[PDB]
Structure formats: C-alpha cells, structure tokens
Amino acid sequence: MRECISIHVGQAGVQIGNACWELYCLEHGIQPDGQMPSDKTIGGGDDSFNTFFSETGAGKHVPRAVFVDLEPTVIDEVRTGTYRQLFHPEQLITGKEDAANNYARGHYTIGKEIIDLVLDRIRKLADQCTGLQGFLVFHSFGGGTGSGFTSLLMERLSVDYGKKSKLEFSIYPAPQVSTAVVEPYNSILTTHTTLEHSDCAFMVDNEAIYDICRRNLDIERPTYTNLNRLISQIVSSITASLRFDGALNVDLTEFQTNLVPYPRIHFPLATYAPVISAEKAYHEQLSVAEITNACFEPANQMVKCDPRHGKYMACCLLYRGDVVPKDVNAAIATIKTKRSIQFVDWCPTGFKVGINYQPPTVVPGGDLAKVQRAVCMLSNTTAIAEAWARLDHKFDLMYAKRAFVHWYVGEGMEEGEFSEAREDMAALEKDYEEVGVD
Amino acid sequence: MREIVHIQAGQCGNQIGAKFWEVISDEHGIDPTGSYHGDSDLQLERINVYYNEATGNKYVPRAILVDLEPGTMDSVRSGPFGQIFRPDNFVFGQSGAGNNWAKGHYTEGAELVDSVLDVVRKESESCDCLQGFQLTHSLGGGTGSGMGTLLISKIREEYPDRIMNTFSVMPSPKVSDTVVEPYNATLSVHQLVENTDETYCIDNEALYDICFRTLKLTTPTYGDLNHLVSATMSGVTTCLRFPGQLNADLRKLAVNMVPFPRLHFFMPGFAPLTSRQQYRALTVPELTQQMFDSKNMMAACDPRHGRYLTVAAIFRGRMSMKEVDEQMLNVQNKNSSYFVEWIPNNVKTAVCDIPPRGLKMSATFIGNSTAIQELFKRISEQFTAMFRRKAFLHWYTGEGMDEMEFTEAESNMNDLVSEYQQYQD
Amino acid sequence: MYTFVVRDENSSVYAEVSRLLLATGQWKRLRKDNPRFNLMLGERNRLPFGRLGHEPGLVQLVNYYRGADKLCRKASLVKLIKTSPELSESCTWFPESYVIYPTNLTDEREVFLAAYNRRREGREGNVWIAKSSGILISSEASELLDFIDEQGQVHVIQKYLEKPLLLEPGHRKFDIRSWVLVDHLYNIYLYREGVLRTSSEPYNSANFQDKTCHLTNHCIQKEYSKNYGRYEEGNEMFFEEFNQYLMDALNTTLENSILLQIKHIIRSCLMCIEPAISTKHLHYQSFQLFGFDFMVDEELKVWLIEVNGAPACAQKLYAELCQGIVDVAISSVFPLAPTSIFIKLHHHH
Amino acid sequence: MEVIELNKCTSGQSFEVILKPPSDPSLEEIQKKLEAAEERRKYQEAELLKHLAE
Ligand SMILES: Nc1nc2c(ncn2[C@@H]2O[C@H](COP(=O)(O)OP(=O)(O)OP(=O)(O)O)[C@@H](O)[C@H]2O)c(=O)[nH]1
Ligand SMILES: Nc1ncnc2c1ncn2[C@@H]1O[C@H](COP(=O)(O)OP(=O)(O)CP(=O)(O)O)[C@@H](O)[C@H]1O
Ligand SMILES: Nc1nc2c(ncn2[C@@H]2O[C@H](COP(=O)(O)OP(=O)(O)O)[C@@H](O)[C@H]2O)c(=O)[nH]1
Ligand SMILES: CS(=O)(=O)N1CCN(Cc2ccco2)CC1
Ligand SMILES: [Ca+2]
C-alpha cells in the first residue's frame, strides 16, 4: 500500500475537499468521529482505504489531508462542522487576510510568508507514509489564493518531492457563480506556472456543474453545496481505484500512463451519468448501454465542448454498481457505429474499463438519487482546448487595455509575466491543434 | 475579524455619518445605548466590522468624530444615537474653517490632525486585522474637505497598504452654502484621485432633485438630503455588514471595480424611491428598472452619456434569486452599448436576506461609469469662471497658498477628465 | 429585443437577411466583437464555435454547422462518399472520383490509373476532369497528373459527363443549383425555386481545350463566352421555363425526371453526416444554407457535382429566399411579436 | 473487438478492449523570485513615502 496526500487550497478547494471526505467516509463506513467498525486491524494496516486514511491507536481513521486558506472563515467551518473530529488542528492552516482575488497576492506577497509553514505540515503527513505516491491538489482557477498560492506550492513540492506525482482538481471560472472580474488573469497565470509541475489535471467548469444541477436536479438557483456534492461524486469516481481493491489506476503513476501520452496535454475530460433527482417520484433505472451512451452527450461533461470535432488520445470507463464486462462491450460496439469517435493515428482505438461492484454512495438528504449503476468516462479529447480558447479570449480583451494590471504590479509581479503566461497558452492551444486537426 | 475604522469630518461629514450610524445601528439591532436587541443571528455575524464589543455586551461604533468647531458634533452628542459613540473619539477644535480648504488643510487643520491620528492609531491597534478606513465628508466646505484630505494623506502614510474609502458630497450651485465650493472641491479631488481607493461621489443637486421631483418634497432640507445618503450608505455597505460572497471585502471590491488606479469614483444608486402609494409591493423587474434609472442615481450624471467600466448590484430582501439573475441579464443584454466590451462580465450581483427598515426588498447600485466626468466638468467649469479673475483667492493666499497651487489642481482635474474620455470611446 | 452580429461583410445573402431583421423593429445589430448576441452571422473561415453557448441567459444561434466542411470540400466530399456505408463506394449518383495529392507533398493516384487503363482498354469514353478548391479537361491521363504536380494543393479527378443533357435550341450544357436550408431541428428544407446556369455555346465534345461550352460557371460564361444572354437572361433559366421545356420537348415534368433524384441526393448527404454535425443536445444551435450543384445526362439521370456552404443566390430570388430564411431559421428560434416556399424532406432522425 | 488483461477480484474487475491499433526551478531560484518581487514592493512603497515626504 502506498499513501496519497490531498491538499485543498483556497475556498473552492476547502469546500470541495470537505464534501469529498464526507463522501469518502460514507463510502468506507467511517463515522464522523473517525471510527471504522468494519476495520478489524486496530491502529494500522495496509488496506486500500489506508491510502487515504491513517490510523491512530485509539482506532481513529484520519484523512491524509491538509487544508490551506489565506483566510480563516472557510476552514473555521471544518473545525466546528460534522467532521470536526476527523482532523487534528495541525491539518487546518489559516491566515489572517486573503488574496483579494489577486494571483500575485497569493503567489508573492502573502504566499512567501506562509509557504514554509505549509510545507512543514505536509512534511508531517509525509513522515507517516511508508511509500508515498504523490498529491491530489484541489483549488480554483479564479480565486487569488487558489491560483496564486497553488502554483507556488506546486513549485516547492516538485523540489521537496521530486520522484512523486501530482494530480489537480481545478475549478474553471464560470460567470454565473463568479465573484471576480479578473479571474481570466488568474486562470492563465496559474496554468502557466503550474503546467510543468502537474502530471494530470481534471478541469471542472462551474458552468457545466451549474447547468447539470438545474437540468437534472431541478434546482433553479444552485448553491455551492449543490455544486460540491455533485463534484465530490465525480472525484470519488476518479479516486475510487486508489481507495478500493482493483487492477486499474491502482496508483497515481497509472493516471499519467493511461491518460497522458504527452506531458503538456494532461487535461482529460470527465463525463458522468446518471444524475437523477432524489425529489423524483421514482425513476426507471438506466442500463449499461444507456449510461455508456450518455458519456458522449455534452450535457453531462464537466466542461461543455464537442468531442466529435476533436480527437481522442485515450479513453477510460469507470463503472460503479451492477455492471458485467459483457454488457460494457455490448454498448461500446453499439456506440462506435452511432457516434463520431476519432482517435489520433498514433494511439490505439480502445477503452480501458474498470468496474467497481459497490454502487455510488449518496449523501443522506443530498440531491442525487440512488442508482443501480453509474459510469464516469475520462477521455483525453483535443476538444477540451475550447475552454482554453474561451479563457484566452477574455484575457486578451482586458490585457489589451492593461485593465486591473496595476493591482498585480503593486504586489511585486512584473507586467511581462502576463505576456509570458499568455504566450505559453498560445503554445498550448497550438499543441492541441497540431494533434487534433488535419 | 476584518475591522473597518470610520471617520466623519466637518459639518456635512458628521451629520451624514450620524444618520448612517443611526440606520445601520437599527439593522444590526443595536439600540441608542449600544445594547443588542435583534432577533436574527445574521445581525451579529459580522457586527464587529463596524462595531467594537465592550463590557456588558455593549457595542460601540468604531468611528471617530472630527471637526474644527464644536457645534455640529455637540448636536450629534445630543442626537438620537449620540450617547452610543465613544466619548474619547470626539476630537474637535474651536476656531472653525470658514469654508476655507486652506484652513482645514494647512493652518487650523494641521494644529489638530496629530491628535486625531492618536485616536485612529488607538482604534487600529485594537483590530485583529484592519481592512481599511471609510471617511464621510463634503468637498465644498473647509473641514471635511481640507482637513479630511489632510487626514487621508496622513493615514495612507502610516498605513500605506490599507484601503482608503470615502463618501464624498460634491458641491452644487443649486444647493450651495458659499461661492468658493468649487475651489474647495477642486483641491480635494486631487487628493482623492491620489490617495483613495474608492470614492462614492454624491452630488447634492442629485439629492435635491430626487427629493423635489421623485419624493415630492415641496421644500427639501439638508435633513431630507441626508436621509437618502443614509439609505445609500447602508446599501453600498451591505456586502461588508452581512454574510456574502461578492464585494464582501474592501480590497476585493476595489479589485473588481477599479481597472485603473485613478478612476475609482463611483455613482451610487438606490431603489425603491417612492413618495407618500408607498405600501405597494415592488416586483423584481421594477426594482431593477429603477436601480438602473438615472433618476435613482445620486451623482447627477447621465449614464447614457458614457460607459460602465464595472457595476456592483446588491439586492436586499427575500426574493427570487433566479428572477434577479434574469432581470440583471436582461438589463445588460437590452442595453449592452453602455458597457465596455473589453471587460467581460463587469456586472456583479450580490444578494442579502435582510432588507432595509420599512421595505420588503430593495436594490443598491454602485457604478464605475465614464459618465462621472460630467461631474468633474461642472466643478472644473465653475472653478475657472472665478479663478480666471482670481476672484476670492485672497481667502486662501492669506493662509499661505500660492496661485500656482490652484493652477496645478486645475490642471490635475482636467487631466482626470481626459483620462475618463479616452476610455469612453 | 433580439440581438445579432455580422462577421462576414461579403455575404450577399445574410446582408439582405440583416436588412430584413432590422426592418421588423424587433432585432438590433451589435459590433462584431460583442459577445452578448442572440444570432451570429459568422465568418467563412475559422469561425470560433468554441466561444458559442457560454453566455448565461442568451440562447445563441449561428448560421453554420460545425463540421459541414466535410461535405463542402472537393477532396473531403469524395473521401466522405467512399468511406460512409450510408453512401457506399457504389454510390450511383456521384461521378467516379479519386483524390490526387501533388508529388511535392491517403493519395489515390494508383487506384485512379487502374480504372483509367480499364476504360482505355474497353473502347469506352475515357474523358476526365481535374479541379480543386483553374480546371483542366482532357482524355489522356498524362495531362491530368502533370497538371496537378505543377500546383501545390490537393486535387480531385472525377469522370467527366461526356453525354450531358443539352437544351434546344443551342445544343448547350447546363447545371442545376438548388438551395437547401437545414434548421436547428435538422429539418431539411428545399427551396421551391432553382436556377439553371446554362452555357450559351454549343456543346463541343471534340475539343476540351476551349472550356467555354463545357463549364457552366456564371463568370466564365459572362467573360469568355460570346453568346451570353442570348436565350435566357444572364444564362439563368428558372424552374418555370425549364419545366415547360421538359414537357414540350421530352414529354415529362421537372418533378418526375429530375427533382425526385435531387431530393433523394440531398437527403442522403445531409442525413449521412447528421450524427457528426447535429446540434440537438448542444449548448448552442446551428442552421446553414447549402448550395447543391447537379448535372443531368441525356438519360435524365442526376449526378452530384459539389456542395457549397456559403452560396450566393439568383438575383430574382433574393427576397423570397431571404425572407424564408428568417421565417424557418431565425423566427422559429426567436419568434416575433403561406404556403411555405420550402419542400420539407421528412426523414428518420 | 479484443479483451485483454482481465483482472477479477471480490470488489470488481477491470479489463482492456482494443477496437483498432494505431497507424524545473531549484530552491535557490525560487527564493530569488520571491525576494525579487519583494524588492520591487519595497521600492514602490519608498517612492510613495518619498512622495508623501515632499
Ligand atoms: N464549484 C465550486 N466553485 C467554487 C466554490 N467556492 C468558490 N468557487 C469558485 O472559485 C472562484 C473564486 O475562487 P476562491 O476559491 O473562492 O478564492 P480563494 O482561492 O479562496 O482565494 P482568495 O482570493 O484569497 O479568496 C469563483 O469562480 C467561484 O465560483 C465551491 O465551493 N465550489
Ligand atoms: N464530372 C463532370 N462532368 C461534367 N461537367 C463537370 C464535371 N465537373 C465539373 N463540371 C462542370 O464544371 C462546372 C462546375 O465546376 P465546379 O463546381 O467543380 O467549380 P466551382 O465549385 O468553383 C463552381 P461553383 O460556384 O458551383 O462552386 C459545371 O458547370 C459543370 O458543367
Ligand atoms: N447632503 C448634505 N450636504 C451638506 C450638509 N451640510 C453641508 N453640506 C454641503 O457641504 C458643503 C459645505 O461644507 P461643510 O460640511 O458645511 O463645511 P465643513 O464643516 O468645514 O466641512 C456645501 O456644499 C453643502 O452643500 C448636509 O447636512 N447634507
Ligand atoms: C434654511 S435656509 O437657510 O433657507 N437654506 C438655504 C439653502 N441651503 C441649501 C439647501 C437647499 C436645499 C437643501 O439645502 C439650506 C439652508
Ligand atoms: Ca486498520
């Protein structure tokens, strides 16, 4: 068994993290106090759930997590919430004043004065690991701490943990729930300095989660709670292979191998189905084919975009519940004949399939209804670059007038770091185009 | 614990400040003695942003009262909530400023500013994490204008990395005390351009017209003008005084509203505004159509004469947040030729569950519009009509000022107008 | 109030569409860089489909199907017909074609020569044509391949219709242009009005050098031909006259002998690529006007020449069609506060 | 349509299906950057004070 440390940075990272460890506990039968009745080895063991939970002598299963925010009001909820007893205080790091949606403020001004403290706390979690795999970093693009401080952390992690892997869960800015005008600036800044330090990143566009919540859950104005309970269902599906017995995506290294054939192109698209409203009278349960086919509808992709007009470099299906391989292949064959699935010539046209018999756990009182089977597809499409195009466009509009730049220069950042970051994205978009178009 | 220190200077400053503290003290459930008697936990969630908590569960506003004559502040001390202010925070002189910017900034004011900073420093040392300051003052008089800007200059020196925010009453010949108000306003606007991060420009003629035309007050008074300012100040600060996500921070509001350092002058707005057919409920569409109506704005500028750099809307009360988003998007989509196309999503919407006193719901408007240059032209034009004849300069030269300084303030503001002009195209 | 932007100033069609929209008083045009729009009249090349459908509250519609270039490209069309089982390589209404890459750059050079040596051996007519996205007509394979190598872009060689259907009097060639509009629901509408772009020169089969009687292009007939405008005005015969001709001369109708096949061909092509370009579950919606070009042989068999994705319209039909584009393509998505001029082509979605 | 590397365990199974074959900054440099931006902040604030001193 090899452990995985999770890092949650900024508000988005903290709240999403809080909603995943709630789900992790419910999935592994852990209670809010950290006790785990089914765990028959008290105070130790190298089980699959131990990759995410350490154990004390008193029998407490403690997440291998760290929560970092430059402002205390969000992490303070964790300290007094339902799962306050899971973490000990050293895991919850909070500052006094935030980054004010200013990448340069999180990275430089405030980041420099707290980075050495975060590393020290992370080192304490590392010293508990007999064979550490890597890190899972949850953050937002648009937030000042989530963008500015995360890139600084990723740089130091690559220095202090060279031979380790790092995966990202990144929240893509969506105006319908965004509280900042300069989020394009922050998103591009943080992608530029993180690109060479992240081995694989899952971008969730708030626009996609927001509309899934209004369409499938009949929520007229979704809250962050709604947005996060849904995000933690997908994240649970991606991290299941690390927390349960299995032979696919068994360690963090396997994500790069199975999903990223070229380093810079490490942003797989995630699709999920089915999302059903608990408030529904009673739904007719979907089949293996029906839910597989749904993986090729933009309406349930974590980022809206048309894979039909891109090219796949790798496709991966993660099923949970009542699924046998025979039914999966029966659906794939059907979808290949009715869908536009174009791989690149230097990749096999196939799918790596993983099946976990335990169906998706649902939070009591949540929005999602219990289903018999669900699938999450991780496909590396060139179509995801549409999100880069959208973002870079907004950057160019503001930067062309130097709007809001004075706030960044005022924190010690040099104006040329803007163009330097935008030029990198220019190269990223071109890479996707070299791989996808003819 | 993100504390804000409040400062009210001069006649206008203290009279508007007092009413402001009277209005929000009601919203947070604080009585005239500082005892909380509200019914909601939301009232206290962020109470320490503007209030200090003494012994006996008393809440004392974190405000300092300043003036060069005792009269106005003597009234505040006798006013409704006068007993709730910290006695040591009354700092005043005896000479006055004679509506003379140079007296409040160079002579009489200099003699008293140090003892004011002694109070500011003492309030700051007790803050867990001080955000910044907010000043209430007029620009047409002597103390709020001359000493007010003097205080700001000295505050930015001792706290160079904190946010400086002001509610500035702009003078108007229609609602005038003296003929030198354009002189005092031009000199202050240069200090504000240089040393503030956010300035809510409140034109006294806008306040007058709204009382006469909209509210149907046959003969407005300063008291009536200050009612509006109170309601607007309460509205523009709802983001700070209650739980929220957007513009909930002074620095975050600046970062989202100020694309260029010098262009931080806002047009505030308020809705509803009804005369006394006052009990009629207001629908969200109506609430939005008014909030964007120029007649509900208090800078006395025409928004359709410029373009919005950024906007901050705050809807208070229990309403359809889905219906709010629909109407806000309808406004931007039905008049998208008045928003700049080089700042995507420059209109941010915030919601508050607690409504103002006596209203089921309301909306407050904060606009960074290039149309504000119309205000700076009025003042500039009135300035030049006198300065070209050197009229009334002797009041100022007698306090040690030279004409060169007036020539500089004149140039500094015409520059500001040119800066607003290049971004309107 | 609906809003739209214009990103193709050279489009004669949507220029009039924009004229009609504003004439209703319920539409308002915006700068070409304003993201808040209901409808985009987008540019031809490099239309930013990735920035569509991301404006909260605004349902956004565009006049171009992303991915239709597969059908509106010479080399792309051929590759689509030989590889799509719905069309099959045995497609009976598309001339035998091959994709030929110049030697300075897969390529079907050898496959083309095989069918050539077969025809040349069987005494059969072996006249071919070469073109690209400058055309050459020859009966010798050496002249066709040498012509493409002198260029630097992909070319296509397809069988030339040696026995075209000629209009009398004049003994002259022609081609039929039919406008087809596909709306956001993917209903296929065929404009009731077509145009015959006819040649004013007597067809001469013993001289493929003088390409004035073989090429029915409205520009070549008006520049290199000497009988332009003799028989019909501007070498444009409309369906009313062409129908009366088929009756007096051939004793049949334009509906039976030609239009049935045209509607069958339009269905087969558009229904084929529907899974690839449909915007049924997309965050934005698409419609697009297409221009199909057909040939007719002396047997009254219809052949497909190409599809145009940004076609112009006949002068006499700009009002009827453009008003129709607003009724079925724009108002059907943004209504305003007959006897349709289209022929719906029902199909199994 | 080929299935390869089928692994079965109590809590699930995983396999692979092939439809078709194919055709950093050191610690020294980071500290300088953090101090470089801090040096440009000190300078900018000194100019502010120098300005306010005049
Ligand atoms: N999906 C989701 N998005 C969130 C959540 N919280 C914040 N966001 C998004 O994150 C972006 C803002 O970044 P934040 O994480 O709030 O900022 P920060 O990282 O705390 O950094 P600061 O500027 O110091 O506050 C906005 O686009 C929000 O929509 C959340 O709980 N779930
Ligand atoms: N295989 C073939 N048999 C007979 N005629 C042919 C032919 N291929 C092309 N032509 C002639 O060429 C003309 C059309 O050429 P083509 O359409 O390939 O060029 P183009 O696309 O630039 C004109 P358009 O404006 O219709 O797109 C027709 O008038 C037709 O008579
Ligand atoms: N809105 C409002 N404006 C005022 C009030 N009192 C004075 N003013 C304005 O402020 C200017 C005079 O400044 P004043 O405050 O009296 O001078 P100071 O006491 O030296 O600061 C004039 O333009 C007045 O119109 C008031 O109570 N309300
Ligand atoms: C009582 S008064 O002396 O007649 N009056 C003169 C005008 N001045 C300014 C003004 C007009 C309206 C509101 O405020 C207020 C005092
Ligand atoms: Ca154990």
Ligand SMILES: [Ca+2]
């Ligand atoms: Ca590395």
Ligand SMILES: [Ca+2]
């Ligand atoms: Ca004295």
Ligand SMILES: [Mg+2]
């Ligand atoms: Mg934060």
Ligand SMILES: [Mg+2]
């Ligand atoms: Mg006075």
Ligand SMILES: [Mg+2]
């Ligand atoms: Mg063509």
